[PDB]
Amino acid sequence: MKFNPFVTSDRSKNRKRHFNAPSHIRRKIMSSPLSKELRQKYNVRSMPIRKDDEVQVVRGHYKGQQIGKVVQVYRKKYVIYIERVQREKANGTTVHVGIHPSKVVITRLKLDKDRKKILERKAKSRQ
């Protein structure tokens, strides 16, 4: 239950602050869970999505065990794109299909100097 008198429970206010969130908050909103074998390795639950990391769809129409990779993170639409998750147009040209990052589970992360810092910070905070 909510107890802080400075955070709201208004549905309209929450929807407004979610739909008009800045770009540095959209990257935190667009977070995806990690795989089971990697969660126990990194001692962290979730992690934001970047352009280089691989990912695997768990729910939706284009779901399965085929490992994929992201190619675009569309922060404006709160969506990500995968090179193999695609669809044919009327004329036959290929185009990526949008899937929400909350409906996808990560299997590989780009080991960056900032990513390692975020991982160790989350691990030390989880303790």
Partner: protein, 260 residues
């Protein structure tokens, strides 16, 4: 807003301009020039009798009547019929007033709380609460109210040691204190007979907080227990007692219908 219709400056035409006599806005070059001005029957006008902010919202009640209602709810919560006819699952409960030891108020986790609720055979009501958690019906969902939750048991305690933490996450539960008994929580919806779970000290403090018919209350200065009207509320024994039937009339159960 108290100004919902009087923002427009408009006057009526009069006898001529047979369109109407209702005031109409002045201007031109706009399809709103000449429409209905402020009024009940007009579009974009003020409503009839604009609700003022100084309406009588709150209603005060006598303290004696408040205490009467609280004692009535407490007496109704002790009868199994009145609390069973409300909806609570008390089929497996050993004793209707559940008076537990003082160790429960020292709880810090909710696992032991759920374990105690399952041991006291009161978990069926919480399961019913979990099962009946549908969505609000109607336009109330827009006004930050999208959940319907049925009321479950209320643990009445005293001398808090962390029991609010252990009972603050169970749905349908209610936390109440002996020194602050609320009618809105004891008899929700205007119906008496809510299932209650007490503590040893919370149950021993009732004799000193309200008093008996012999001695008045110690906490409350000038309060005494309400008077009892009918000493025997069982009509069957009174009507079937030999003293009543000793000087009765013959039954005379003949119908005497209409004769042709």
């Amino acid at each position: 807003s108290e100004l919902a219709g009087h923002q427009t400056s408009a006057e009526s035409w009069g006898t001529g301009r047979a369109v109407a006599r209702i005031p109409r806005v002045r201007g031109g070059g706009t399809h709103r020039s000449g429409q209905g001005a402020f009024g009940n029957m007009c579009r974009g006008g003020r409503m009839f009798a604009p609700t003022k902010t100084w309406r009588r919202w709150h209603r005060r009640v006598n303290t004696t009547q408040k205490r009467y209602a609280i004692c009535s709810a407490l007496a109704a919560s002790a009868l199994p019929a009145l609390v069973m006819s409300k909806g609570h699952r008390i089929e497996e409960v050993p004793e209707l007033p559940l008076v537990v030891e003082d160790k429960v108020e020292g709880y810090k986790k909710t696992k032991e709380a759920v374990q105690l609720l399952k041991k006291l055979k009161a978990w069926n009501d919480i399961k019913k609460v979990y099962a009946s958690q549908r969505m609000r019906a109607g336009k109330g969902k827009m006004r930050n109210r999208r959940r319907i939750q049925r009321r479950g048991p209320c643990i009445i305690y005293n001398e808090d040691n962390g029991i609010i933490k252990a009972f603050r996450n169970i749905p349908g539960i209610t936390l109440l204190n002996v020194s602050k008994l609320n009618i809105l929580k004891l008899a929700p919806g205007g119906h008496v007979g809510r299932f209650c779970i007490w503590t040893e000290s919370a149950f021993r403090k009732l004799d000193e907080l309200y008093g008996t018919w012999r001695k008045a209350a110690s906490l409350k200065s000038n309060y005494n227990l309400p008077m009892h009207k009918m000493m025997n509320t069982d009509l069957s024994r009174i009507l079937k007692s030999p003293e009543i039937q000793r000087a009765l009339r013959a039954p005379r159960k003949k119908i005497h219908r209409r004769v042709l």
